[PDB]
C-alpha cells in the first residue's frame with residue numbers, strides 16, 4: 519500500500535473503556551487489569567468485553583493508523599459507528615456497526631456475519647488500519663510482512679461518524695496480558 523501519508527494521531531477515550539482496562543498516561547496503550555480499576559460506571563462503557571474506543575470521530579476523508587499486537591493470543595481491531603451498543607452481549611458485524619478483524623485460538627478472521635477465514639503467512643506484530651469514508655472502504659495491512667493486504671471491507675454502510683475500535687481480549691490463559699499500543703507515525 520501507500521496510505522501512511524493519511525496518518526492520524528489516535529488516542530484512547532478512557533470514558534468508553536471497560537472498567538477492567540488500564541490506559542497509559544499518554545492514552546496510546548491499553549491492557550487488561552487483573553481486577554476492576556476503581557472508576558465509576560457510565561453509559562459509554564463497554565460492559566461485557568474488554569473494549570475501548572478512540573477519542574477521534576471521522577465522518578469524511580481518508581485515515582490510517584497502526585497498532586502493535588506483539589505476543590497477544592486474542593484481540594479485535596478496526597472501526598465502529600459512534601452509536602454501537604455498549605451494554606450486554608452482541609456480535610461484531612457490519613449489521614451491528616463494526617468493521618473488524620481478530621485473532622482467536624491461532625486463527626485470524628474478519629468480522630463478517632458469518633465470520634470469514636483470513637490467510638496470513640507471517641503472523642503480524644503490527645496491523646495497519648485504513649478507512650476511506652467516501653469510498654466506503656476499511657482495509658487491514660500486515661506491517662510485519664511489508665504492508666501486505668489482510669482484508670478489505672467494501673460497500674460499507676457507515677451510517678454515521680466512525681470511531682477507532684479496540685478489544686485487548688480476556689486473559690483466562692495467563693498468556694494474553696500484553697497491551698495493544700498505538701504505533702508512532
Ligand SMILES: O=C(NC1CC1)c1cnn2cccnc12
Pocket residue numbers: 612613614671672673674675676
Ligand atoms: O457495511 C456493510 N456491509 C459491507 C461491509 C461489507 C453493511 C452494514 N450494514 N449492512 C446491512 C446490510 C448489508 N450490508 C451492511
